[PDB]
């Protein structure tokens, strides 16, 4: 087992009111079985696209999850990951400056 690394970030530089893509890049995990959820204000986003199953030269898996979003000043975004390697899910918040 390898614990998943997560990066949460927009496809394009964010601008309040401009449609964009919010990404959740999950890497360095083994076994391939993973549960990825993207959240807005602590609520599950239903429309989340997953990239197909791929693995790196070190045998660990990676997957890009993304959703369409229009950033605002107040809305919060997060990505929550459930994996066998972790006792509890790991949540990463989107920071517009990262």
């Amino acid at each position: 087992q390898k614990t998943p690394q997560i990066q949460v970030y927009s496809r394009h530089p964010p601008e309040n009111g401009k449609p964009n893509i919010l990404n959740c890049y999950v890497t360095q995990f083994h076994p391939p079985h993973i549960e990825i959820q993207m959240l807005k204000n602590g609520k599950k986003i239903p429309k989340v696209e997953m990239s197909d199953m791929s693995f790196s030269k070190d045998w660990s898996f990676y997957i890009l999850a993304h959703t369409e979003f229009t950033p605002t000043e107040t809305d919060t975004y997060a990505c929550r990951v459930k994996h066998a390697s972790m006792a509890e899910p790991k949540t990463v918040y989107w920071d517009r400056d990262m």
Binding site: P13, I21, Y25, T27, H30, P31, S54, H66, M98
Partner: protein, 273 residues
């Protein structure tokens, strides 16, 4: 090796079922060009690169027929690995395979690869000589012995030196301009206040291809190793990549250097108003 071809294959055992989930992904110079997935509505090898679309229905039928044999191979090998490791059917297990070839500067075989992993760890790999094996631990010795005793490596050697080199030559011809293709990064510097008498300056690199890049920081022309924080290269999801590097610095007089194979020359950047 300047050019390469690999097949990344995974079999995940499904508890309750006789059949595991099988996924095979082909790469040319680390760019995905074909894919098979037994979980599909119509399980078949499919083009994953535009330049592959020129291949006829006899090609896909043949490749799909191979994936069917691989599916059975991994199904049995998974069953046998339970014995070597004293595991039960009730759980899920992962068998992975990476194989293919590297071509030299002369386009001839540089070396062939054949590696196996069980549960995310090295299990057995074919040596560069293409006749001897490296077993990872004691359990892997049972397979190594069964493979030496059957002379299994010969059959792999032939694919690696023949078909592998042959098809790689074809795919490089058919794939022409997309292999050498590049995208220059679009660099910008953001300003964020950190504490008292300090600021964080972030240098972004966006919209670049391939993923290889180098971002650095300088103060009066001098390099900063440990005192600089960065993110790992991440896909934008549009085919391009992103990366950033930041320095926590006390309140211009700070430069950033962007290095990408797509640039006519390196890029040097600094804070705006």
């Amino acid at each position: 090796g300047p050019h390469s071809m690999r097949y990344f294959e995974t079999a995940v055992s499904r508890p309750g079922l006789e059949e595991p989930r099988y996924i095979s992904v082909g790469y040319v110079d680390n760019k995905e060009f074909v894919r098979f997935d037994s979980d599909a509505e119509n399980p078949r090898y499919e083009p994953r690169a535009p330049w592959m679309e020129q291949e006829g229905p006899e090609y896909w039928e043949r490749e799909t027929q191979k994936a069917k044999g691989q599916e059975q191979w991994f199904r049995v090998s998974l069953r046998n690995l339970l014995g070597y490791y004293n595991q039960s059917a009730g759980g899920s297990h992962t068998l992975q395979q990476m194989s293919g070839c590297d071509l030299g500067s002369d386009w001839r075989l540089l070396r062939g690869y054949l590696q196996f992993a069980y549960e995310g760890r090295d299990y057995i790999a074919l040596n560069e000589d293409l006749k001897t094996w490296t077993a990872a631990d004691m359990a892997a010795q049972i397979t190594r012995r069964k493979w030496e005793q059957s002379g299994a490596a010969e059959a792999y050697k032939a694919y690696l030196e023949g078909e592998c080199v042959e098809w790689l030559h074809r795919y490089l011809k058919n794939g022409n301009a997309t292999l050498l293709r590049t995208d220059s990064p679009k660099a910008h510097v953001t300003h964020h206040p950190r504490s008292k008498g300090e600021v964080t300056l972030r240098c972004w690199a966006l919209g670049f291809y391939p993923a290889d890049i180098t971002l650095t920081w300088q103060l009066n022309g001098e390099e900063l190793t440990q005192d600089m924080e960065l993110v790992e290269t991440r896909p934008a999801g549009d085919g391009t990549f992103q990366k950033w590097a930041s320095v926590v610095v006390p309140l211009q007089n700070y430069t950033c250097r962007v290095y990408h194979e797509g640039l006519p020359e390196p890029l040097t950047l600094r804070w705006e108003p």
